[PDB]
């Protein structure tokens, strides 16, 4: 039965996503903070899509990595075609949702992925950062404060719901993110979408710089 097939696909995708690490992304005063539990040094679950757009995902690496490459290609093509400022995170989220829905419906096995698209305002501009979560079935939701993906999210979601504070500095935001993720440096990947950057906002904080903030 088609309903039974949908149930099987949903259960498979949920089990696959729950078996991976947990990724948390929350907005702060300086933009968007990305914190992910990644023991590997080569594979990265956080990347840059465009000047003011970031990427975060959790699940099977070979799937969301391909999706990240496709999104980068789409963003670069759109930027070169019309203009760099015509590229927005909403378009990337819509394309990701459509692609994931098509994969979930037509392909033999759905992608066990959970994407997070973040967007910050341009330089010299004021706007609340935007967060988008795209699920394995194509559903897309808008989160105003934080996004938690991968693994067991309920304890982390409750911890963030209790401990979140808007306009917090980078240090406090990192502390809150790590504390909620537990519920070290060598097992965490941290990147920031710094809204104060002139053109390219994405920036990675690793090594002694990451240790200093902890």
């Amino acid at each position: 039965s088609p309903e039974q097939a949908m149930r099987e696909r949903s259960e498979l995708a949920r089990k696959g996503i729950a078996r991976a690490k947990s990724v948390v992304a929350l907005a702060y005063a300086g933009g968007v903070l990305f914190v992910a539990e990644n023991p590997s040094r080569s594979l990265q679950k956080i990347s840059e899509l465009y000047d003011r757009v970031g990427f975060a995902a959790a699940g099977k690496f070979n799937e969301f990595d391909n999706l990240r490459r496709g999104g980068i290609q789409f963003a670069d093509t759109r930027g070169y075609a019309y203009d760099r400022r015509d590229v927005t995170g909403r378009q990337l989220a819509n394309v990701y949702a459509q692609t994931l829905g098509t994969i979930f419906t037509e392909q033999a096995k759905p992608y066990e992925v959970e994407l997070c698209v973040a967007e910050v305002a341009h330089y010299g501009e004021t706007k609340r950062p935007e967060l988008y979560r795209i699920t394995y079935d194509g559903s897309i939701a808008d989160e105003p404060h934080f996004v938690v993906m991968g693994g067991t999210t309920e304890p982390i979601a409750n911890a963030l719901k209790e401990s979140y504070a808007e306009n917090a500095s980078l240090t406090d935001a990192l502390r809150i993110a790590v504390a909620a993720l537990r519920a070290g440096v060598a097992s965490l990947e941290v990147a920031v979408l710094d809204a104060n950057r002139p053109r390219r906002a994405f920036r990675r904080i690793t090594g002694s710089a990451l240790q200093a903030l902890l």
Partner: protein, 223 residues
């Protein structure tokens, strides 16, 4: 054909002539060469008339198509890039005798200073574009005469009305020095068409005001 565009504090104005010729013979006397592509931009195209009309229609269609698809209008630089792409793609036909040179004037809502939001962009045959910084630009066969007249008359521009008068006078000079550019036809009551763009959008200039300005200029020249 001659199309002029100049910046005044708080907006921009574009005007064009009404004559189309097939060699020396006059084939048209009421050709409209200034189009309103969207709420805040106006496009004037010189060269072959058919190519100009097709370019204006296709450009407006493309801009509206993008706006409806994405739910947000293109930025000004995006519009410039699309027009430049069209001009570049028209090069092969242009070498065969179907050349079309556009002129883009618009108002930037997202610009910081409202009084300097007016924009004038000129294109060449290779698709290259340049944002004008001297306040005025012209295209067409009589472009040189109109540009040289505006160089001397631009110091008198202080608002929209003075800018419109200067544009009409520049078109009059271009028609006075170029046979392919039609002057104000008082016998038939045909006058150049103009478009004024400001924070409230782009609107067509009524024929009565342009007729009054042209008559004033003619009376000034006669005496």
């Amino acid at each position: 054909t001659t199309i002029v565009a100049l910046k005044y504090p708080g907006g921009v104005v574009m005007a064009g002539d009404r004559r189309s010729t097939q060699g020396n013979m006059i084939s048209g006397r009421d050709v409209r060469k200034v189009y309103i592509t969207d709420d805040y931009t106006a496009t004037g195209i010189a060269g072959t008339a058919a190519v100009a009309v097709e370019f204006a229609r296709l450009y407006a269609v493309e801009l509206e198509h993008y706006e409806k698809l994405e739910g947000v209008p293109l930025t000004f630089a995006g519009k410039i890039n699309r027009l430049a792409i069209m001009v570049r793609g028209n090069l092969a036909a242009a070498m065969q005798g179907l050349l079309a040179l556009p002129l883009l004037a618009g108002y930037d809502i997202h610009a910081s200073d409202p009084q300097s939001a007016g924009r004038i962009v000129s294109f060449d045959a290779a698709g290259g574009w340049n944002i004008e910084e001297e306040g005025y630009q012209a295209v067409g066969s009589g472009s040189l005469f109109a540009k040289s007249s505006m160089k001397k008359l631009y110091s008198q521009v202080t608002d929209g009305d003075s800018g419109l008068r200067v544009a009409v006078e520049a078109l009059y000079d271009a028609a006075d020095d170029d046979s392919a550019t039609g002057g104000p036809d008082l016998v038939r009551g045909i006058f150049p068409t103009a478009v004024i763009i400001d924070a409230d959008g782009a609107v067509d200039v009524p024929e009565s005001r342009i007729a009054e300005l042209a008559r004033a200029i003619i009376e000034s020249r006669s005496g």
